[PDB]
Amino acid sequence: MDIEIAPQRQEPLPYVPEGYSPFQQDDIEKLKTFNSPYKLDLDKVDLLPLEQIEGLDPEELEDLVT
């Protein structure tokens, strides 16, 4: 006996709450990635101003270096 039939189960338009922006793949790399705590980060030449206000004998030679 001939069968009955159902519409294709489509996809609901995606829900995205509260103006959420997802974290990108780039963002994720920046969170995984160790960088040394020790790394730090930090025109005309001007003249400088002026401020205001027979000799020693063998044993004698050895005494000298000792």
Partner: protein, 1486 residues
């Protein structure tokens, strides 16, 4: 005893010597240079004694060259070498050896002007060694005096001077008085060209013999030569130009001044010439060797102002050379005079020439003079000055190579000044890096010349240059390098087993080793060694603070900060406290870092819920430090620590004042998230992180204070800031990356928690999915663990039991990578998850030991485990969790006590009702039971509802109505009806609150989330006002709630009869349970749903597969019919009449009541034998009415009546009227009651109510209630709550049904996806006709509708009808329907339009609720998937009965009656026919 080795080849020794001098220099081991030089000095003298004078000589030079910046390539260079820290412990003796050699080589004649120059300025070249060898040196002088063919007088003078100076016995030679005369003979006083010196020598001689028989100056110089010096002087630009001096030597001390002054004026009175004289004058000044006086110094200062002022006045390179020479002779004066300020001016003039002349030669000369001064000044505290100077030089250099050249004069090991501290070398190298190296812009490794291994390691460690040859270096040097670089290439096995015997870094081995392990761990994202090295540092470094008696390295400072931060991020809170305390203890050395110890001690107290110590910490810190002067880093540090909620006392107000007004008023740049003040990127990142943390905790405060909306908004700001923080170009620093990890995971936890509280499964799924995704790619174990622990709890709450298993396994695995003994808060979480509550509360005692009394943490865990604690020892903060727990504990106790009395046990297994009895106006004692219940009633009434999550509000409501129900069946209670009223609207609250939160949170302006509030209180009024309004509507309807009791498992009915002004409720115990019926049904539904999917039907090809699909669906249909049958015949035994639409005739009812009571009087043992009729318990009318509502003609009439009897007997029983069933005359009850009921039915008037509203709770939505045999013929719509019903009715002035005009503006959608082509065939006809003779109507067919057109369809139609899958979610978002306020009555005639996805203890959702929230007043959908031929049969029938045609009238049916009359057309009466359902108000077409 030591052996002696013959040396056959000296070059072997030199090799060993140079090899050692190089190593020692490279490893900063300066003290071993001394002991090596001592050997070397002995080598030189041994050469001298064996008459290897040629070899000895170049050995001296070798010794000197290997130990000094300056280089020598003659003995003359040795002789005039300045003292420095590098050589001053041997230089004296070296020069004496050099003089010995000059003597024995008989080279005195050729060395003569140098030997004179030496001794002329003996104060500078010689007489500084405090241990100077007197007898030797002065003997050397006499011997020179002896052999010299000239200047015998000069030597004589010096020798006499020394012997006086050093108190030596003349008798090292005849008479000393005669010696002077002998010097005075014409030939002895013969000096040749070297007469220039004489003045210097005599002056030094005079000093020791002034006031004695001094050889006077006139004995040597005739009066003629001496008079005409001064005579000519005051009668004249008068100098021997050819000899670069003055015409006269031995110039009078006073006549100096008139010459001095002369020239000054001469300057004032072409530039080439003047300088030339200037050189002449100042060269004679050095020569004469006069002691400095103001007159000379005034002229100097003046002469150098003159030169400087006229640099640009120089053009020729002849004047240029003259200038360099004058500057050279002047610099030498400053060293003769110890004039450091004055020398630094000569460096300045040289530098200025280097700029004006644009000459690298002058700049090189400038750099070196700078270095000279440094070596001479010997103040390693000064060197910041030099580095900043060399910054300006380097900047001034003419090319890239020239800048690198100047750099190397500064990046030079003798600049270490024999400093043996790691702190100094780090300090020097980092500053050279920041201020100088970075200006060189080099991208390949330069191995800088004449610098140590250590210097190269710290400098390139800080660089980003790619291929540094670090493996050239000792292990400890490579270890500092790796730690600086964040790169770790050292083999573990080797790091333990190599060693250099001689290295400065051996003095710092433990420190270097733990800095390496810390940074190694972090690099690999582990904590393997964290605990080992924190303990090591505390006990073997930090503890020996005052042993080591040394300034602390920046290397160590930075280490400690990184260690505190990694301890804190891993919650090693115990170690954190001990470390921090220890630091704040060794304050003598670590004072600069103590701000970090203070902040991190605070966070550790808080993490261990030691609120006591945290608060002491708070208020001390606040007073003890001012912000207006604190640098931005310390202010960030102070502010960050004060953010924690537990630092307040649920005082969102105070918190907001502080961070929102006070703190911004005092440190604005703490809130400059746009970086307008342009801070260094590293601090700017830290500012954003501060503000992220503020918004994160502000979410926590708001939500703990029932401010769901604004807490959601805060959270979202926190997340947006984090997204913007990641976009900054920065190469994120470890400390900030961890900060952001802690913060970002927190805000997901917080958002999910906020949405659990209001029951929104929809948002929780979204967030939990986003979080899960992120975790995956992460690698930090403490973050991965904590997130998995959280998600696992979440999967428990939503009862997604498969993910629950998977994430428990993952969480348990993740825990392995944690230090279980160090992190107690992760351990208790692990123990909890795994049901080891015993091991839990007791590992909390082994972690706090005797400190257990200052942490709320073991009490907080008591609260999580369900216990309620002593109010006096509970934090104000956690007081609501406390009471909530108490309520439940109080309930389990009272319920379990009552339940072991057969009386109450039986009562809990009985259909119960309220009001059932009219009031007056012993295993468990009855007074005790009424007492415990009134106690429960009042404890439930005490609690603040705004502190409840929706699922708890639900349980408290049911607990509240159960307590009222037991009480009222047991005694008569104070304020009877009012308690039923407040309870009716209490049970409605949890129905309403999720929907309103859904609506509000969805119409939130998105601008709110990027700019850097409802509640249960007002909602309480709206819920009870709804009920008051409904009651007063006088509508002749029933409003019946259907709910499920989580606590008891009871079915729960209530009814609201507005016309009768009556409120009744009853509890049905329940053969299957509600959760079993729910299972059996879901199984049926999910199977039929399955049979429906195109995946399955598409694979059906043969006659055989056809019949199987039909067997299965007919079978599924019978299973569902049977389940509903079971429910009918179990769940409502005796009370199906509660649903009856019949109204009793009042005149007839009263005669029935007389009879009814007479019948009870004569047939109940109690009424027959005890008291009188005035003491009998009287039953409420609506209970009596139930009898009149029975149909004696029905087949199961007697079962239903019997059950009514039981109900009534029960009412009398619980109120104290016993009736042994043993002696009730049931035969007579049966006969007489049936008689009176037959009489009533046979004569009754037929007046019924107009419509039935079913308030259906989300838990009961899935059941097709309307198809129960006592419901299937009734006009019914569903509603989700009293508040929704009453606003819908207020919207249409309480007029049922909803007249809806059908004569125009009707929308339709048909087969929007071309997957239902037979359906299209059937309806193509009527729909296309209606768009014809019915204006502003629209049809969309075989065509995907676009979002904006059905949004306008919905808000601009008198009728909306839709045929296709679901309710059109695939063409329009949930969000926009929800933003609407008025929607058209909708026929959602598709698969599963009214279905709902269920999520455990959270609220479900589906298309149905969204329309209601869009302001749809009537929406019709299917509870599950339906198949096309049958459902279209139903639709066709639905339209025809309602009147939906093109010839608009008459007596059509309402949507309600029309639906129930149309179910029957379906072949599968349940799988398809039970599927349609209506929410909202009944409509009729007009």
């Amino acid at each position: 005893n030591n052996i002696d080795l013959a040396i056959e080849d000296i070059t072997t020794v030199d090799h060993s010597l140079n090899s050692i001098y190089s190593l020692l220099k490279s490893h900063h081991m300066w003290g071993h240079i001394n002991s090596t030089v001592k050997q070397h000095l002995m080598i030189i003298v041994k050469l001298i004694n064996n008459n290897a004078l040629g070899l000895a000589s170049s050995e001296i030079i070798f010794l000197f060259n290997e130990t000094n910046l300056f280089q020598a390539h003659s003995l003359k260079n040795i002789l005039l070498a300045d003292f420095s820290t590098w050589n001053d412990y041997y230089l004296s003796n070296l020069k004496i050896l050099a003089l010995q050699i000059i003597l024995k080589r008989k080279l005195v004649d050729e060395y003569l002007p140098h030997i004179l120059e030496l001794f002329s300025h003996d104060k500078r070249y010689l007489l500084k060694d405090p241990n100077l060898k007197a007898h030797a040196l002065t003997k050397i002088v006499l011997s020179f005096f002896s052999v010299t063919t000239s200047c015998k007088v000069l030597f004589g003078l010096k020798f006499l001077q020394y012997i006086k100076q050093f108190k030596l016995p003349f008798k090292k030679f005849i008479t000393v008085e005669c010696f002077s005369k002998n010097l005075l003979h014409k030939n002895y006083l013969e000096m040749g060209p070297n007469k220039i010196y004489l003045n210097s020598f005599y002056l030094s001689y005079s000093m020791l013999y002034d006031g004695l028989d001094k050889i006077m100056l006139l004995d040597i110089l005739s009066y003629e030569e001496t008079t005409e010096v001064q005579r000519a002087i005051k009668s004249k630009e008068y100098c021997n130009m050819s000899e670069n001096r003055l015409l006269w030597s031995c110039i009078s001390v006073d006549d100096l001044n008139v010459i001095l002054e002369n020239a000054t004026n001469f300057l004032q009175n072409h530039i080439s010439a003047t300088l030339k004289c200037l050189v002449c004058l100042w060269s004679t000044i050095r020569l004469e060797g006069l002691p400095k006086n103001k007159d000379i110094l005034r002229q100097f200062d003046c002469t150098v102002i003159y030169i400087n002022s006229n640099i640009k006045s120089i053009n020729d390179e002849s004047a240029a050379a003259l200038l360099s020479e004058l500057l050279g002779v002047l610099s030498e004066i400053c060293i003769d005079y110890k004039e450091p300020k004055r020398l630094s001016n000569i460096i300045s003039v040289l530098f200025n020439a280097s700029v004006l002349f644009k000459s690298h030669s002058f700049l090189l000369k400038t750099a070196n003079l700078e270095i000279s001064n440094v070596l001479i000044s010997n103040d390693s505290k000064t060197s910041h000055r030099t580095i900043l100077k060399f910054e300006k030089f380097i900047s001034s250099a003419q090319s890239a190579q020239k800048k690198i050249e100047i750099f190397s004069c500064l990046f030079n090991v003798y600049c270490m000044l024999r400093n043996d501290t790691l702190s100094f070398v780090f300090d020097f190298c980092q500053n050279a890096f920041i201020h100088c190296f970075t200006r060189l812009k080099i991208t390949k490794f330069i191995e800088f010349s004449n610098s140590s291994e250590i210097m190269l390691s710290v400098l390139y460690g800080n660089s980003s240059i790619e291929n540094i040859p670090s493996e050239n270096w000792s292990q400890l040097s490579r270890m500092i390098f790796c730690s600086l670089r964040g790169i770790f290439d050292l083999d573990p096995l080797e790091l333990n087993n190599t060693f250099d015997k001689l290295h400065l870094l051996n003095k710092y081995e433990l420190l270097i080793r733990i800095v390496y392990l810390l940074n190694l761990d972090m690099s690999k994202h582990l904590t393997t060694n964290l605990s080992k090295i924190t303990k090591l540092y505390i006990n073997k470094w930090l503890q020996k603070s005052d042993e080591k008696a040394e300034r602390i390295s920046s290397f160590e400072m930075d280490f400690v900060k990184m260690l505190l931060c990694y301890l804190n991020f891993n919650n090693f809170d115990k170690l954190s406290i001990e470390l921090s305390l220890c630091i704040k203890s060794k304050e003598k050395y670590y004072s600069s870092i103590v701000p970090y110890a203070d902040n991190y001690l605070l966070e550790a107290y808080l993490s261990l819920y030691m609120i006591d110590d945290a608060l002491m910490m708070k208020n001390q810190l606040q007073k003890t430090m001012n912000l207006s002067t604190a640098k931005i880093e310390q202010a960030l540090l102070h502010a960050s620590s004060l953010i924690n909620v537990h630092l307040w006392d649920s005082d969102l107000t105070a918190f907001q004042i502080y961070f929102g007004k006070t703190l911004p008023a005092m440190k604005p740049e703490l809130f400059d998230i746009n970086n307008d003040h342009n801070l260094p990127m590293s601090l700017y990142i830290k500012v954003i992180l501060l503000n992220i943390k503020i918004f994160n905790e502000s979410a926590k405060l708001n939500i703990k204070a029932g401010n769901v909306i604004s807490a959601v908004i805060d959270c979202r700001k926190a997340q947006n800031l984090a997204l913007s923080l990641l976009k900054k170009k920065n190469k994120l620093s470890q400390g900030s990356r961890l900060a952001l990890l802690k913060s970002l995971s927190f805000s997901f936890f917080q958002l999910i928690k906020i949405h659990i509280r209001i029951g929104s499964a929809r948002d929780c799924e979204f967030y939990s999915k986003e979080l899960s995704r992120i975790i995956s790619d992460l690698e930090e174990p403490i973050i991965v663990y904590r997130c998995l622990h959280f998600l696992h709890r979440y999967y428990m709450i939503t009862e997604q039991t498969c993910l629950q298993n998977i994430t428990l396994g993952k969480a348990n695995k993740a825990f392995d990578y944690l230090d279980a003994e160090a992190d107690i808060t992760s351990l208790t979480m692990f123990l909890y998850d795994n049901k080891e509550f015993v091991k839990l509360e007791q590992s909390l005692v082994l972690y706090f030991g005797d400190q257990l009394e200052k942490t709320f943490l073991p009490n907080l865990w008591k609260l999580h485990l369900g216990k309620d604690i002593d109010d006096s020892i509970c934090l104000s903060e956690y007081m609501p969790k406390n009471v909530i727990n108490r309520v439940h504990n109080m309930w389990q106790k009272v319920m379990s006590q009552l339940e072991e009395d057969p009386f109450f046990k039986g009562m809990f297994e009985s259909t119960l009702g309220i009001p059932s009895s009219l009031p007056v106006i012993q295993k468990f004692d009855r007074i005790a039971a009424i007492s415990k219940l009134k106690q429960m009633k009042e404890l439930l009434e005490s609690l603040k509802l705004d502190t409840l999550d929706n699922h708890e509000l639900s349980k408290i409501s049911s607990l509240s109505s159960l307590t009222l129900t037991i009480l009222s069946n047991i005694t008569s209670i104070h304020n009877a009806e009012s308690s039923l009223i407040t309870n009716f609207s209490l049970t409605d609250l949890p129905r309403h609150m999720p929907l309103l939160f859904d609506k509000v949170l969805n119409n939130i302006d998105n601008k709110n989330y990027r700019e850097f509030n409802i509640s249960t209180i007002t909602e309480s009024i709206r819920v009870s006002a709804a009920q008051k309004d409904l009651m007063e509507s006088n509508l002749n309807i029933n409003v019946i709630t259907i709910d499920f009791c989580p606590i008891t498992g009871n079915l729960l009915l209530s009814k609201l009869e507005p016309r009768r002004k009556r409120r009744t409720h009853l509890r049905l115990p329940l053969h299957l349970s509600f959760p079993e019926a729910t299972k059996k049904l879901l199984s049926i539904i999910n199977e039929s749903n399955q049979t429906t999917s195109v995946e399955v039907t598409n694979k059906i090809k043969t006659r055989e597969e056809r019949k199987s699909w039909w067997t299965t669906r007919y079978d599924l249909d019978k299973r569902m019919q049977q389940l509903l049958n079971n429910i009918e015949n179990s769940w409502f035994n005796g009370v199906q009449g509660f649903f009856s639409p019949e109204v009793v005739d009042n005149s007839l009812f009263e005669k029935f009541k007389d009879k009814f009571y007479e019948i009870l009087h004569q047939n109940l043992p109690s009424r027959k034998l005890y008291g009188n009729p005035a003491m009998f318990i009287k039953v409420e009318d609506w209970v009596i009415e139930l009898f009149l509502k029975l149909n004696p003609q029905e087949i199961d009439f007697l079962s239903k009546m019997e059950d009514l009897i039981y109900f009534v007997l029960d009412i009398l029983l619980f109120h104290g009227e016993e009736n042994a069933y043993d002696e009730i005359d049931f035969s007579m009850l049966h006969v007489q009651l049936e008689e009176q009921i037959k009489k009533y039915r046979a004569t009754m008037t037929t007046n019924s109510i107009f419509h039935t509203f079913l308030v259906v709770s989300s838990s009961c939505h899935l059941f097709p209630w309307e198809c129960l045999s006592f419901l299937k013929d009734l006009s019914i719509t569903r509603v989700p709550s009293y508040v929704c019903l009453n606003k819908l009715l207020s919207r249409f002035h309480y007029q049922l049904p909803l007249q809806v005009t059908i004569e125009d503006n009707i929308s339709m959608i048909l087969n929007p996806n071309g997957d239902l082509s037979r359906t299209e065939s059937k309806f193509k006809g009527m729909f296309q006709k209606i768009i014809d003779a019915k204006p502003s109507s629209q049809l969309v067919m075989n065509e995907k509708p676009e979002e904006e057109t059905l949004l306008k369809m919905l808000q601009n139609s008198n009728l909306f009808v839709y045929i296709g899958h679901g309710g059109g979610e695939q063409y329009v978002r949930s969000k926009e329907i929800k933003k609407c306020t008025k929607i058209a009555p909708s026929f959602l005639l598709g698969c599963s339009s009214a279905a709902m996805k269920y999520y455990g203890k959270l609220e479900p959702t589906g298309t149905i609720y969204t329309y209601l929230l869009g302001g749809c007043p009537m929406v019709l959908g299917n509870l599950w998937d339906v198949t096309d031929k049958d459902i279209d049969k139903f639709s066709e029938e639905l339209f025809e009965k309602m009147g939906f045609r093109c010839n608009t009238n008459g007596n059509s049916l309402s949507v309600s009656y029309a639906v129930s009359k149309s179910r029957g057309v379906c072949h599968l009466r349940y799988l398809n026919g039970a599927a349609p359902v209506i929410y909202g108000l009944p409509i009729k077409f007009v």
